[PDB]
């Protein structure tokens, strides 16, 4: 019954700013790790960044080509996820997904920090730069 709807995508000039939103439903958004993933045109899925939960201090991690330009945030009061993008380039354009993020670590074979997986996705919102 999980539902995620991205929004805010549109046409933007190089160097410009943009703010994508994600309305989360169907689960416990508050303690849930969230991730942004994009698909450039004619290319595959690409991990953008991920915000953690309370125990992790809402820490956020970023992909190298995007570190410094992009900002991931949350307002848990209305179960919204956000993506603040500044100084965009052509290659920033694609279809942007938000997805509920699960943590996995096998005790006997695992290596820290284990692995993160994406159990629920939204339909995406189109960024054109």
């Amino acid at each position: 019954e999980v539902q995620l709807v991205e929004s805010g995508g549109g046409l933007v000039k190089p160097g410009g700013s943009l703010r994508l939103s994600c309305s989360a439903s169907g689960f416990d958004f508050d303690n849930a790790w969230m991730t942004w993933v994009r698909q450039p045109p004619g290319k595959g899925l690409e991990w953008v960044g991920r915000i953690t939960g309370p125990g992790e201090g809402w820490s956020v991690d970023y992909a190298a080509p995007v570190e410094g330009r992009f900002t991931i945030s949350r307002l848990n009061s209305i179960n919204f996820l956000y993506l603040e993008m500044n100084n965009l380039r052509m290659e920033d354009s694609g279809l942007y997904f938000c997805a509920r993020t699960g943590k996995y670590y096998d005790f006997w074979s695992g290596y820290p920090p284990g692995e993160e997986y994406f159990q629920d996705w939204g339909r995406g919102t189109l960024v054109t730069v």
Binding site: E56, K103, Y105, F107, W108, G110, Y111, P112, P113
Partner: peptide
């Protein structure tokens, strides 16, 4: 903290051997 959990477990695995 997840990033601490994984680290402590890995350590426990190392020490108990």
């Amino acid at each position: 903290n997840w990033f601490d959990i994984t680290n402590v477990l890995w350590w426990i695995k190392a020490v108990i051997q």
